[PDB]
Amino acid sequence: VIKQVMKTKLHLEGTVNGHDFTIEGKGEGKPYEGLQHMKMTVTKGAPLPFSVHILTPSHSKPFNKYPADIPDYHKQSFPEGMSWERSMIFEDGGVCTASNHSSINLQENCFIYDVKFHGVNLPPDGPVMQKTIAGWEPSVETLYVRDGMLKSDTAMVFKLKGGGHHRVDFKTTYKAKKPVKLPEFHFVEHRLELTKHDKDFTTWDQQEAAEGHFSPLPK
């Protein structure tokens, strides 16, 4: 059911700093190569009063490159689908929660994402509300099974405009709708980039490269 090239369609409803908004995404990628892109459009609540970088990682699990000896938890869950849930704890008290439902439209060869996003206690002079985030650095995600689900940890660090970094702890749970071959403990390299946009970020292009692997260090 997962072809060498596949489309994506996203619908996200969010509330950040008491500001409601709807985002619509349309993209495509090479699932087995771990490459994908998507064009976002803030259909409601534009212009957003916060850094859109807090939302970019909440916009696609079937596009992770994996070796043959690591079962792909996400690809195996389709066509039944999966869901993912996540908490994002910032260094300054800010907390965002995101959750998704991923399904497939076999006719269109397109993945359907329905996402919820909630941002609270973002400090008014912090980098999210002040829009001083330049983008995310690449990241290494650590994944292991917990209760038959795939749990992961990621110190997702963003670059500040003017230099310096700010860490956001991501705790995610991936939940396949039907049982799949569970993988052993492993890592996923991630590089998320916001490449093009209009002046006030009502529309933008975001891409992601992702590769799973065991530790390269010998025992």
Add this chain to the structure above:
Amino acid sequence: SVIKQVMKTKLHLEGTVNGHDFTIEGKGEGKPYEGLQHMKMTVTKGAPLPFSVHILTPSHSKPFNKYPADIPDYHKQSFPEGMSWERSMIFEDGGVCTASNHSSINLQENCFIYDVKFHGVNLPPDGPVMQKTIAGWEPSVETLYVRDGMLKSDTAMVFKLKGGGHHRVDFKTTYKAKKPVKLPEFHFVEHRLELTKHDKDFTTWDQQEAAEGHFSPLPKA
């Protein structure tokens, strides 16, 4: 350079975990440019330890990181003046450990001297640390970046439970060179710490660690 292809290590650690005082003494060796090292630990006071010794193994040597030419080695550059590190370890079950070190060098002995403090609090009595159900650490990837001229890091250090399953410990570490050094850009460090040999009650044991720094292998557009 003051850092040779082969270097010795000497460690002294004083700790208090679950209100239990103890001292560890370490003696080891490694290849600083290859990112390989090993240390023989001995609990000189407070043996046998009433908790899993795995909580202490990452507190026992920053001059032993392999780095490419385009990533300045923050730790090696800090010698002979030395460096120090500080760390918090937050467990999934409320347990908190804090560790801090002072690293110096004995140029005549070609030996790094480590003085360590360790404190463990609120470890649940039926948790994996007090129940000694930790089999060891999994390999890890640490993320490093500069903050106030110091080198900060974040590592989800996950340990394997005996009988399967995992338990995450959030490590927040700060490395502090005593004199200014060429600071590196944001990067990662692969770690694989292994406890390879020991006596029945872990009064002595052999610990080793492979560590390699690198930027992300993924291409940037």
